[PDB]
Symmetry: C3
Subunit: 146 residues, 3 copies
Amino acid sequence: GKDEVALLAAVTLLGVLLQAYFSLQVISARRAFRVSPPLTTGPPEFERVYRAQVNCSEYFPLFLATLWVAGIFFHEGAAALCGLVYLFARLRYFQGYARSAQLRLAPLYASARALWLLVALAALGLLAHFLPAALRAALLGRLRTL
Amino acid sequence: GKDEVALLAAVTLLGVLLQAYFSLQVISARRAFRVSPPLTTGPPEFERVYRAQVNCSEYFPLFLATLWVAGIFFHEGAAALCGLVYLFARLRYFQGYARSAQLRLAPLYASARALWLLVALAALGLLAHFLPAALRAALLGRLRTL
Amino acid sequence: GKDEVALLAAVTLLGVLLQAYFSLQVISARRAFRVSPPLTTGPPEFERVYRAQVNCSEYFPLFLATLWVAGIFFHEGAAALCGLVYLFARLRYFQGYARSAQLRLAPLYASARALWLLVALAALGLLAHFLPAALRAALLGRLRTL
Ligand SMILES: CCCCCCCCCCCCO[C@@H]1O[C@H](CO)[C@@H](O[C@H]2O[C@H](CO)[C@@H](O)[C@H](O)[C@H]2O)[C@H](O)[C@H]1O
Ligand SMILES: CCCCCCCCCCCCO[C@@H]1O[C@H](CO)[C@@H](O[C@H]2O[C@H](CO)[C@@H](O)[C@H](O)[C@H]2O)[C@H](O)[C@H]1O
Ligand SMILES: CCCCCCCCCCCCO[C@@H]1O[C@H](CO)[C@@H](O[C@H]2O[C@H](CO)[C@@H](O)[C@H](O)[C@H]2O)[C@H](O)[C@H]1O
Ligand SMILES: O=C1CCCC2(CCN(c3cnc4ccccc4n3)CC2)N1Cc1ccccc1
Ligand SMILES: O=C1CCCC2(CCN(c3cnc4ccccc4n3)CC2)N1Cc1ccccc1
Ligand SMILES: O=C1CCCC2(CCN(c3cnc4ccccc4n3)CC2)N1Cc1ccccc1
Ligand SMILES: N[C@@H](CCC(=O)N[C@@H](CS)C(=O)NCC(=O)O)C(=O)O
Ligand SMILES: N[C@@H](CCC(=O)N[C@@H](CS)C(=O)NCC(=O)O)C(=O)O
Ligand SMILES: N[C@@H](CCC(=O)N[C@@H](CS)C(=O)NCC(=O)O)C(=O)O
Ligand SMILES: CCCCCC/C=C\CCCCCCCC(=O)O
Ligand SMILES: CCCCCC/C=C\CCCCCCCC(=O)O
Ligand SMILES: CCCCCC/C=C\CCCCCCCC(=O)O
């Protein structure tokens, strides 16, 4: 039973490791521009790397929630593949943003498409687990029991 | 077995969609006040919408964790209903905060009550799954085995 | 079956309560230095408590994801104990940071060690659930079927 969700757990763990990488880059930028904590404002190069990390952290629970709903209710393999596509787009988004605000846009749109696809698979999976039972009950004249 | 958690998954998915709506409002505010990334400070109207979104994102994993613990250990329906009450209070909090800092207070207190209730249901459910076994073992003189 | 994950759910709930405590300290600091919302910049004492809370929130979903992957795939007790060690190190990190930026360092390194250990247990558990099957299939000449 655990192996039915092992792929989702592996993709989740890869997402956690990618967040540690983003945190490591913010530590390297803090030394490079002497922006010591608790300071978050500084040169534009520091601000971009810092904002890229904040964006990736805020979206991490959204990726996690939809990966698990899609993987359990739609299909495990399809959701894990979309999750991988999302993580790789977020790595490119972070790398682009570090160079410039404009270069973050193409990988940001790619990550938005991957997250919207996970949302769509989760919705399709939830409908596949609810609509057939409702349809069966309506045809049998037992919808109120449901 | 999956349908025993389908309601929690649907409420989780609705929470993800509400976060996309909050992100869409911050994008609209960025254009309205020319506060281009990586900038997060700007006019007070921009700052309120931006802070409302940050608050909703930071609390999203807390809502998610308690919704799932309460839904699995207490009762699925009761937790999903509290989760819906929490999400609707957070939408009103965001809308109020966009108009003024004071107008965010009543829906913020409403969202705090809904989150505290989910916490209480999760605690009640965890106690319901641990205390009876401990009581049974104490009455049988087998508490050390437990 | 639920009681096989009840310890992880209890540790998760304790982490949620600790986040409410961190939020309560930021509210007390807002009154102490008249830094009214939506303002996040202010005196250094306010900024440290505020940054300590933001750091704890951003890392909360990372703690949650690894606690659950390690607890399900490695061993429940070992993961719940590491999770407790992580939460206690984060409380000390918050208390140290409130006094000074330097005093946050020792408990921050302690919390990083606890989180890296949860990551290692999750990886060990995922390998324990995948490598034996791959090894069995390679020895039987059926790896392609897998
Ligand atoms: C209350 C709501 C009312 C009911 C609303 C119903 C709306 C129905 C939406 C249209 C159906 C979607 O159409 C369906 O999409 C999925 C995913 O893209 C496809 O699925 C295929 O591609 C996806 C892409 O990732 C793979 O993960 C999946 O394993 C594969 O089988 C189906 O082959 C297609 O039939
Ligand atoms: C180590 C700890 C020591 C032991 C501590 C024990 C403390 C016990 C707390 C008091 C018991 C709570 O009392 C109990 O509350 C719940 C929820 O409000 C009620 O439950 C009712 O209302 C809730 C409200 O959402 C619904 O979700 C639920 O389906 C319904 O049955 C029970 O009808 C009531 O009996
Ligand atoms: C594709 C990857 C290729 C394969 C890579 C394989 C790498 C193997 C890593 C070395 C093995 C780790 O070694 C193993 O560590 C764990 C945890 O520290 C120990 O486990 C022990 O201590 C941990 C510490 O928390 C307890 O939670 C656990 O219950 C206890 O049994 C094992 O007694 C030890 O044998
Ligand atoms: O991943 C990203 C990153 C960039 C921002 C965003 C794309 C543009 N945004 C839009 C666009 N059209 C919308 C239509 C209806 C409702 C809201 C809408 N939001 C805001 C969210 N997403 C998609 C997303 C985010 C969170 C959860 C689910 C999906
Ligand atoms: O939802 C909200 C939004 C507004 C802030 C807050 C309400 C006031 N806060 C308080 C009040 N009394 C307390 C008593 C003991 C310990 C801490 C306390 N914290 C801080 C948390 N919550 C409740 C919450 C938050 C996170 C997890 C669980 C619940
Ligand atoms: O908990 C903390 C808090 C302090 C920052 C940090 C420790 C230093 N950081 C490092 C150090 N060496 C690295 C080697 C390879 C890849 C990245 C690396 N990151 C950045 C993450 N962690 C560990 C962590 C964070 C998120 C997920 C998992 C683990
Ligand atoms: N740099 C990473 C790692 C987090 C971290 O180690 N933060 C510590 C050390 S810089 C801290 O308390 N920082 C306070 C702050 O970020 O203001 C991140 O931003 O997520
Ligand atoms: N506006 C939403 C969506 C996130 C988003 O699209 N952010 C992009 C485009 S504005 C970004 O990298 N922003 C950098 C920043 O927020 O400083 C939010 O704040 O969560
Ligand atoms: N102080 C806690 C609790 C969150 C909270 O209650 N925030 C409200 C009341 S101060 C809010 O909308 N704040 C806006 C802001 O933080 O700028 C935290 O920072 O997480
Ligand atoms: C191909 C999709 C068509 C769905 C067919 C549904 C059939 C009848 C809908 C009537 C609902 C009102 C009857 C209520 C009585 C009851 O079902 O308990
Ligand atoms: C109605 C609640 C009352 C609970 C009754 C508990 C009974 C006895 C508690 C004594 C505990 C010490 C005995 C240890 C020996 C053992 O149980 O293994
Ligand atoms: C102790 C670890 C040693 C592992 C032994 C693995 C044995 C043989 C590896 C050869 C793989 C190529 C054969 C492909 C044919 C097939 O398995 O379907």
